[PDB]
Amino acid sequence: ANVAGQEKIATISGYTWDGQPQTEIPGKPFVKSIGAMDYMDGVEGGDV
Amino acid sequence: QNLYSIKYKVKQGVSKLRDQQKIFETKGSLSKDAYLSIFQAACRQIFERDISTFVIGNEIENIKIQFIKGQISVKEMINALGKSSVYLKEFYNPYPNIKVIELGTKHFLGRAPNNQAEIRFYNQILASCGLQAFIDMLTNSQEYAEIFGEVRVPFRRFPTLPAANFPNTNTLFDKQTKQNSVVIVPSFKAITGN
Amino acid sequence: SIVTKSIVNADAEARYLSPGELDRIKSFVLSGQRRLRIAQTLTENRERIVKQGGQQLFQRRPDVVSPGGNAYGEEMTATCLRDLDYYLRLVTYGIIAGDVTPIEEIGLVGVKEMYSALGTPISGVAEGIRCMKDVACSLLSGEDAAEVGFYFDYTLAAMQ
Amino acid sequence: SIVTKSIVNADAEARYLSPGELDRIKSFVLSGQRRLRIAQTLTENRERIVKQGGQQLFQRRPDVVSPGGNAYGEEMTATCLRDLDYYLRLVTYGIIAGDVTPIEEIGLVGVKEMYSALGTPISGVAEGIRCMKDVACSLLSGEDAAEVGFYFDYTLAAMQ
Amino acid sequence: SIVTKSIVNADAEARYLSPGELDRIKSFVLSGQRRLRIAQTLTENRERIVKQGGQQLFQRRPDVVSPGGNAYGEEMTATCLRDLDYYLRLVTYGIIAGDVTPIEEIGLVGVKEMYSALGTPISGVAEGIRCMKDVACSLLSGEDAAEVGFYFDYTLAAMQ
Amino acid sequence: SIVTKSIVNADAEARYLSPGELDRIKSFVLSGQRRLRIAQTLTENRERIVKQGGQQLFQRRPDVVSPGGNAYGEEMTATCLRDLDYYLRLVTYGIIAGDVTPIEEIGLVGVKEMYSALGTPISGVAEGIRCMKDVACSLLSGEDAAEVGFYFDYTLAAMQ
Amino acid sequence: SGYGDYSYSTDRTKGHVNQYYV
Amino acid sequence: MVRAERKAALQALLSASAAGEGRPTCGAEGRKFVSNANPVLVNGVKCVEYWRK
Amino acid sequence: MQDAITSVINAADVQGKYLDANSVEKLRGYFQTGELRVRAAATIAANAATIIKEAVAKSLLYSDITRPGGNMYTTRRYAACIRDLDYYLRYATYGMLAGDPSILDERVLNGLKETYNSLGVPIGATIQAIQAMKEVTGSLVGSDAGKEMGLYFDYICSGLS
Amino acid sequence: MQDAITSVINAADVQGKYLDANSVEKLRGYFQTGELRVRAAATIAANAATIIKEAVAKSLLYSDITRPGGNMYTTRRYAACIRDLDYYLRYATYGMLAGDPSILDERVLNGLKETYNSLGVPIGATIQAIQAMKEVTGSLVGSDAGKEMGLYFDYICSGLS
Amino acid sequence: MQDAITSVINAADVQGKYLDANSVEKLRGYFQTGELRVRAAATIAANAATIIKEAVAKSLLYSDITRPGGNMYTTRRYAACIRDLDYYLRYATYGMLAGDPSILDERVLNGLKETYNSLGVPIGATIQAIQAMKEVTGSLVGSDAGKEMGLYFDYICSGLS
Amino acid sequence: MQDAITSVINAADVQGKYLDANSVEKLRGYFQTGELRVRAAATIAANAATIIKEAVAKSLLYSDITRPGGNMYTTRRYAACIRDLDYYLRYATYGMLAGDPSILDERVLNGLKETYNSLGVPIGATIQAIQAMKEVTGSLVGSDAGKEMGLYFDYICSGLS
Ligand SMILES: CCC1=C(C)/C(=C/C2=NC(=C\c3[nH]c(/C=C4\NC(=O)[C@H](C)[C@H]4CC)c(C)c3CCC(=O)O)/C(CCC(=O)O)=C2C)NC1=O
Ligand SMILES: CCC1=C(C)/C(=C/C2=NC(=C\c3[nH]c(/C=C4\NC(=O)[C@H](C)[C@H]4CC)c(C)c3CCC(=O)O)/C(CCC(=O)O)=C2C)NC1=O
Ligand SMILES: CCC1=C(C)/C(=C/C2=NC(=C\c3[nH]c(/C=C4\NC(=O)[C@H](C)[C@H]4CC)c(C)c3CCC(=O)O)/C(CCC(=O)O)=C2C)NC1=O
Ligand SMILES: CCC1=C(C)/C(=C/C2=NC(=C\c3[nH]c(/C=C4\NC(=O)[C@H](C)[C@H]4CC)c(C)c3CCC(=O)O)/C(CCC(=O)O)=C2C)NC1=O
Ligand SMILES: CCC1=C(C)/C(=C/C2=NC(=C\c3[nH]c(/C=C4\NC(=O)[C@H](C)[C@H]4CC)c(C)c3CCC(=O)O)/C(CCC(=O)O)=C2C)NC1=O
Ligand SMILES: CCC1=C(C)/C(=C/C2=NC(=C\c3[nH]c(/C=C4\NC(=O)[C@H](C)[C@H]4CC)c(C)c3CCC(=O)O)/C(CCC(=O)O)=C2C)NC1=O
Ligand SMILES: CCC1=C(C)/C(=C/C2=NC(=C\c3[nH]c(/C=C4\NC(=O)[C@H](C)[C@H]4CC)c(C)c3CCC(=O)O)/C(CCC(=O)O)=C2C)NC1=O
Predict the structure, then answer these.
(1) Hey, which residues 79-108 in chain D have their CB within 8 Å of chain J?
(2) Alpha-helix residue ranges (DSSP H) falling in chain C
(3) For testing the chain C interface, which of J52, J73, J78 should be mutated: the one with the most C CBs within 10 Å?
(4) Which of K2, K8, K31, K52 to mutate to test the interface with C (most CBs of C within 10 A)?
(5) Residue A22 has what DSSP assignment?
(6) Which residues bind (2R,3E)-phycocyanobilin (chains C, D, E, F) (predicted)?
(7) Using an 8 Å Cβ cutoff, are E131 and E57 in contact?
(8) What is the helix (H) or strand (E) element at residue F79, kind and residue range?
(9) What CA–CA distances, in Å, run from B108 to B34, B75, B144?
C-alpha cells in the first residue's frame, strides 16, 4: 500500500498510528477524498 | 500362558552373561601351559579377538616369552601389550581420539567413560603426549588397581551406579568389532552451568 | 547346570570341551532318570512337606507366630508357608539341574537384604528349611536322602 | 495453659499480672510456631506410632493377647490399639498447651479406678505408652525429642 | 476463550487482530469482575447445589435409584452426585472463560459414547443438570440467572 | 557454592550429608546478610579498585607498557584493565557463594593455557591482582578483610 | 585405511551373486 | 569452620610445583594436564557394581 | 495454545479444584491489564511494516552481513530475513494479548534452532535484530506496554540461543 | 550441577554484570529457606530405611509383580528394587538442599529411561513407588518442607515417564 | 545362555510350577539323546581344523572369490574367512551339547548381519560355506548326530540371511 | 501380512520346492483347527461390546486414571480409550482366524509404542486392560479356543511393553 502511493497508482486508506481507521468524513471508515485525478485518463499506471 | 508370555518373562533382568563369566588370573606356581592360557586370554580382551589373523607373527613374541617365564606380571604384560605396534595399528590409527577414549576404557577398564570431566581429561592427554601416555594413565590408575590389581585380566564389568554407565557399557560390549563407525559416547549433552 | 557351566568355561578359553570334561557330562546324563524320580517324589508330597515342616517350625520357633511376631494370624502364617513352598520348588530344580545354581540365582542372592527389609528374622527362615529337610528325607531312602540333603544344606549356609 | 495458670494466681490474690508473669506469657506465644510444628508431626504419624508401639507391646506382654488375656480376639485387640491412640492424641494437646493439664483432666484422673473396673492391667497400658514413646522419639530431632519425651514421661509416672 | 478464538482465527490468516476484533476482547475484559463474582457465588454453594439438585432429581427420575437402577445404593448414589459435581465445576469454568469451550472439551465430546458404555441413561444425566440449573438460578438475580442459564442450557442440548 | 561442594563429597562416598556438613550449610546461609553487604562494598567501588590497582601495576611492571610489551598502546592497556574487572567481578561471586568454586570454574581452569596463547605474562596478571587486593582489603573492616583476602590469595596461587 | 582394501566398486568377482558357472 | 580447610587447600596450590610433560597445545602451555582442573569431578564419579565382581 | 485465562482453568481442571482465592488473583491480574494490551495490540498492528524497517536500520542494515558471500546477500535471502522479523513481531503480539508465552513454543520455536543451523543463519545476529525491535516497540507503545512486549521478545531470544 | 546460588551467579555472569538488586533478592529467597532445608535433610537421612520400607508396602508388595514371573520376583530383583528407591531418595535430598533440579538431570535421569526399557522394568509401577515415597516423606518433614521435597520427587517422575 | 535343562527350569520358574508331566517329557528327551551328543562333540573337536579345510574345498576354494579384488583376496582377508568357519563350527557344537540354540543368539548372531554389511562380506557365500560344513560333518558323525548338528547350522544360516 | 496357509507356501517357495510331506502336515494342522476358529470368531463378534465393558470395570474404572488429572479423565479421552480396546479385540480375532501373528505387526504394533509415548498414555495400564480382556474372552469361547485367542493377546502385550 506504500508502493502503490509511492508510484502514484492509487491512495489506499489505512489506519492512524494507534489503530483507528482513516476517513475523510467521520461517519464511516476508510472514506477517501476525490477530484480531478480520479477522472483523469491516461495516468492509470503512471510513474511505472 | 503360552510361548509369547513365557519368552517375555525369561529375558527380563540384566543378563545371564553377568553370571556366566570367567575371570583369569595368576595364583601361585603356575606351569608354562597355564601362563599361555592367561596370555591368550589377555589378547582377546585388549584386541577383542585372537591375534593370528591380523599380525605377521613377531610383534608381541617377546612379550609372550617374557610373561611365560614369570618375569613380568599380568599388569605389566597388559601395559606392554596395549602400548605395542599391534594396538596402535588396530585401535588408534583408524579412529579419532574421541573414539580412542571409549575403546581404551573398554579394553583396560571394562566400562565406558564415566562423565564429561573424564572425556576432557583423557582428550588433553591424547593431544599433548599421545597414545603411550594414555595407556599408562589407565593401567596406573587407582580404579584399575582396585578391581584388577596386578594379577587379574580385565573383564566386561557390568556397572550400576554412575547414572549413564550401564546402558553405555552395554552398547560397547554388545557391538561386534568394526560393526559400524559410530561413536557411542561422543560427549555428554551439556547440563546448565559450567 | 553341568552342561552350561562347562560350555561357558570352554568358550571363555575359546576351545572345545576336553575328553575329561565330556565325561563329567556323560556321568550327569546317566543319572538323569534317577534325578527325575527323586524330584517327582518331592513334587507329589508338596502339602505334606510344607504343612508338616511348617507345623514343626512353630514348635521350634514359637515366637514367630506369637502376638507381635512376624507370622501372626491367618494371613501372615499362610505367607509364612508360602515362602517354604518357594524354597521347596527351588530344591526340586536343583536336584534335576545337578547343581545349586537355580537355588543361588533365585532366592539366595540378596536374601538377607530382602528379609531385613520385610522385618522377617533370617534365623527363623533357616530353621524352617531345616524342618522341611527332615520331612523330605523321611520319604526317601538312605541313598536319596543324602542326595537331596546336599541341596537343603546349601540353602541353610547361604541363609546364615 | 500458661496464660491460664498465671491469671489464676493473679485472680487468687486480687491483683494484676506481675511483669514477670507477663514476661512468661510473652515467651509462651513466641513458641507457638514450634509447638504447632511438633504436634503436627505426631498427628501425621499416627498409624506408624500406634502400630509399631502396639506390636512392640505384644512382644513384651504376650499374655494380654493370648487365650484368657484381656485383649484376646480381633475386636478386643482393636480396642487395645484404640486406647493407645487416645493417649497419643492427649500428648499432642499437652504439647500445644505447653502443660500437662490437658493430659491430666482427660485420662489421668481416676485412670486406675477405670482400668481396674474394666479388668484391664494398668501396667500393660503403661508398657504400651513406653513402647509408643520410642517410635515417636525416633521420628523427631534431638531437641524435639526432649519436649515430646516430657509428656510421655509424665503420663507413665501418673499411670503407676 | 474469547481471546484464544480470536488469535487462532488471525493466525490462520497470518495477520493482526482487526479493530473490530479488538473491541470484542475489550468488551470481555470489562465484564471480568462481574464474571468472577457469579462464578464465586456458585463455588461457595457447591454442596447446596449438588445435594439439592440431585436430591430433587430423584423425585423426577425415581427409577435410577430404584432396585435394578443404575444409581442404586450408597456407593452408586454418591457416584451419581459425583458426576453432578463435575458438571458444576465445568459451568464455573465456562462462566469465567466467557464461552462453552471448557464445557465442550471436557465432558461433552463423546459423552454419549461414555455413558452408553457404563450403562447410565443419558436422559437422566440431562435431567440432573436441569435440576442443578434451577437450584443455582435461585441464588442469583434476574440478570445473572440468565447469564449462567446459557451455560446450563448448552450442556443439556449437547447431552440429548 | 559451599552447598554444591558438599553434595559432591557426599555423592563421592554415596551417603547423606554428615551433621558436620549440615552444620556448615546452616552457619553459612545465616550469614548471608553480611556476605551480601561485603560484595556490595566492592561492587560500588569497582572504578577505584581497578583504576588504582592497574595504576600500581604499571609502576611495578613497566615492561608490559613499553614497546614490544603485551599491553603497549592505549587499546591494549584498556584490554589490560578489562581483565582486572573480570577478576574483581569473580571475587564478588566467590564472596557470595562462600567458596572459590565460581572463580575456578570461570577464569582459573586453564588460565595459564589462555595467556600463553595470547603472549601475556602470567606473572604480570598475578601482579595486577595483588595490587587490586590492597585497595579492596582497605575498604573493609577487620574480619571482612580476612574473608575477602582469601579469594584474592587463592586466585594468586592458582595463577602461578 | 590401508593397502589391500575391499570396496564394492573394484570387485569384479561373482562373489555377491552366486553365478557358479564362472 | 572453613579456616583450616582453606589454609590447607591454599598450601596445596603453592607446593604443587610439578614438572611438565608433552607438547604445548595452548601456545607455550597445554601440556598433559589442564591448569587448576578440579580433580574431584573426574575421581568423584565412581563406577560401582552392586554385588561387586 | 492457551491464554492467561485458559492457563488457569487448565491448571485447576487437572487437580479437580474450583477456582480458589489464588486462582482468582491470577484471573484479576489479567483482567486489569487487559485494557492495556488491546491498546498496544492495535498500535503495533498499524505500524508493523515500519517497525521492522526501523529495527533493521538500528541493528544490521549497516553491518557487513549484506556484503557478498554472507547471509542476506541476495534478494531472496534479504527478503526472507525481514519476513522472520515480520514473524517475531506478530507472534510476540499474540503472546502479549494472551498473557501467556504458550503460543511461542507451539508455533514459533518448534525446531527453529535446528532450522537455522541447517540453513546457516547466524543466531546471534537474529537475537540482536530482535533486541532492536524491542527498543523500537517499547518507545512506540510506552513503558508499561513496552515492558510486557519485551517479556515475550526475551522468550523468543532465550528459546533461540 | 548448579545449586540455587550458582544458578543466580551464572545468570548474571552470561551478561557480564555484577549482582544487581533483583539477583540479590533471589539470593535472599534462598538464604531464608536455607535453615528449613537442613532440618528436613537431616530427618530424611535418619528415617531413610523407614520411608522406603513404607513406600514398598503401600505400592507393590502383594501384587503380581512380586509373584513368580514379576520383575521383583527373585531375591536379587527385590534387593535391586529397594536399592533404586534408596538412590531416588538420596538424590532428591541433594536437590532439595541445592534448591535446583539440575543434579537430577545429570546424575539421575541421564539414560535412565533407556536403562529400564533394556531390562524390562515397569515404569508405571516405579512412578507409584516414588509417588508413595513422596507421601511418606511429607509426614515426617512437615507441610512446608514436604512441599519442597515433593518438588524433586515429581521432577524424577516427570522425566521418567 | 541356557541348555535344554536350564530352559525347562526357567520356563517353569516364571509360572510358579513344579515340574509336571509335560516338563518331565522334555527333560527325558534330552537325557536320552545325551550320550549321542557327547560322542559327536568329541568327534568334531578332534577333526576341527580338517573339517573346515574340506568344507572350504567344496564351496569357496574353487570359485573366483579369491581372484584379485574379491573379499578373500589378501592373506588377511583369507585368514579371517576361515576363522569365522572356526567360529560357526565351534558354536554349533556348544548348541548341540546344550540342546538349545540360545547361545547362538547371544554370542554369535548379535549384530552380525550389520557387521558383514559394513565390511562388505557376501552373506550368501557364507551360508554356502556353512551348508558345506554341515554336509562334511554329517558324514563324519553319522545320521542321528549329523541331523542334530544340521539343526544348529540352519539356525546360523537363518539368522544370517 | 500372511496367514498360516501362506506362511507354509512362502517357506516352500523360497526354496523353489513343491509342497512336500512335511509342509503338507503343517497344512493339515491348520485345516483341523479351522472349524474351531470360525466358531470362536463368530462368538467374539457378537459379544464384543460385553468383553470391552468388563475389561474396563475390572482394570481401570475406579482408579486414579479415571479421576481428574489422569489419562482417560475427560469424556473424549474415555471414548478414545474404549475405542482402542475395540481395535485390539478386532485385530486379535483376525490373527486367530489367520493363525499367524504377522497381521499384528504391520497393522497394529507398527509405530504404536511411539504413538503412546507421544501422547502420554500409560503402557502398563494398557497391558492390564488387554490382559483383562484376554480373561473375559476365555470364558466366552472356551478353553481350547481361549488358548488360541490368548496367544495373540500376548503378542500385542509383548510388542507393546
Ligand atoms: C582429532 C579430532 C578431534 C577434535 C577436533 C576433538 C574436539 C573436542 N573438542 C572439545 C571441546 C570444545 N571445543 C571448543 C571449541 C570452540 N569454541 C568456539 O567457540 C570455537 C569457534 C571453537 C574452536 C574450533 C570448546 C569451547 C570446547 C569445550 C566445551 C565445554 O567445555 O563445554 C571436546 C570435549 C573435551 C574437552 O572439552 O576438552 C572434544 C573431544 N576431538 C577429536 O578427537
Ligand atoms: C542414581 C540413578 C540411577 C538408577 C535409578 C539406576 C538403576 C539401575 N537399576 C538396575 C536394575 C533393576 N532395577 C530394578 C527395579 C525395579 N523393579 C521393580 O519391579 C520396581 C518397580 C523397580 C524399583 C522400584 C530391577 C528388578 C533390576 C534388575 C536387577 C537384576 O536383574 O539383577 C540397574 C542394572 C544393575 C543392577 O541393578 O543389577 C541399574 C544400573 N542407576 C543409576 O545410576
Ligand atoms: C523364590 C525366592 C523368594 C522368597 C523366599 C520371597 C519372599 C517374600 N516374602 C514375603 C513376605 C513374608 N514372609 C514371611 C515369612 C516368615 N515369617 C516368619 O516369621 C518366618 C520366620 C518366615 C517364613 C518361614 C511373612 C510373615 C511375610 C509377610 C510380611 C508382612 O507383610 O508382614 C514377601 C512380600 C509379600 C509377598 O509374598 O509377595 C516376599 C516377596 N520372594 C521370593 O521371590
Ligand atoms: C467431567 C466430565 C466427566 C464425567 C461426567 C465423567 C463420568 C464417569 N462416571 C462414571 C460412573 C458412574 N456414573 C454414574 C451416574 C449416574 N447414574 C445414574 O443413574 C444417573 C442418571 C447418573 C448421574 C446423574 C453411576 C451410577 C456410575 C457408576 C456405574 C457403576 O459402576 O455401576 C465413571 C467411572 C467411575 C468413576 O467415576 O471414576 C466416569 C469416569 N468422567 C468425566 O471426566
Ligand atoms: C546481486 C543482487 C542484489 C541486489 C540488487 C541487492 C540490493 C540491495 N540494495 C540495498 C540498498 C539501497 N539501494 C538503494 C537504491 C536506490 N535508490 C534510489 O533512489 C534508486 C531508485 C535506487 C537505485 C537502483 C539505496 C539508496 C539503498 C540504501 C538504503 C538505506 O540504506 O536505507 C541493500 C542494503 C545495503 C546494501 O548491501 O547495499 C541491498 C542488500 N543486493 C543484492 O545481492
Ligand atoms: C512463525 C515461526 C517461523 C520462523 C521463525 C520461520 C523461519 C524460517 N526462516 C527461513 C529462512 C531464512 N531466514 C533468513 C534469516 C536471516 N538472515 C540473516 O542474516 C539474519 C541473521 C536473519 C534475519 C534476522 C535467511 C537469509 C533465510 C533464507 C535461507 C536460504 O534461502 O538459503 C526459512 C526457510 C523457508 C523458506 O525460505 O521458504 C524458515 C522456515 N518459519 C516459521 O514458520
Ligand atoms: C563368534 C561370533 C563372531 C563372528 C561370526 C565374528 C565375525 C567377524 N568377521 C570379521 C571379518 C571378516 N570376515 C570375512 C569373511 C568372509 N569373507 C569371505 O569371502 C567369505 C564369504 C566370508 C567367510 C566365509 C573377511 C574377509 C573379514 C575381514 C574384513 C577386512 O579385513 O576388511 C570381523 C572383524 C574383526 C576381526 O576379524 O577380528 C568380525 C568381528 N566375530 C564374532 O565374534
Answers:
(1) none
(2) 2-12, 21-29, 32-43, 46-60, 74-97, 101-105, 111-118, 122-137, 142-158
(3) J78
(4) K31
(5) P
(6) 70, 80
(7) yes
(8) helix F74-97
(9) 22, 10, 8
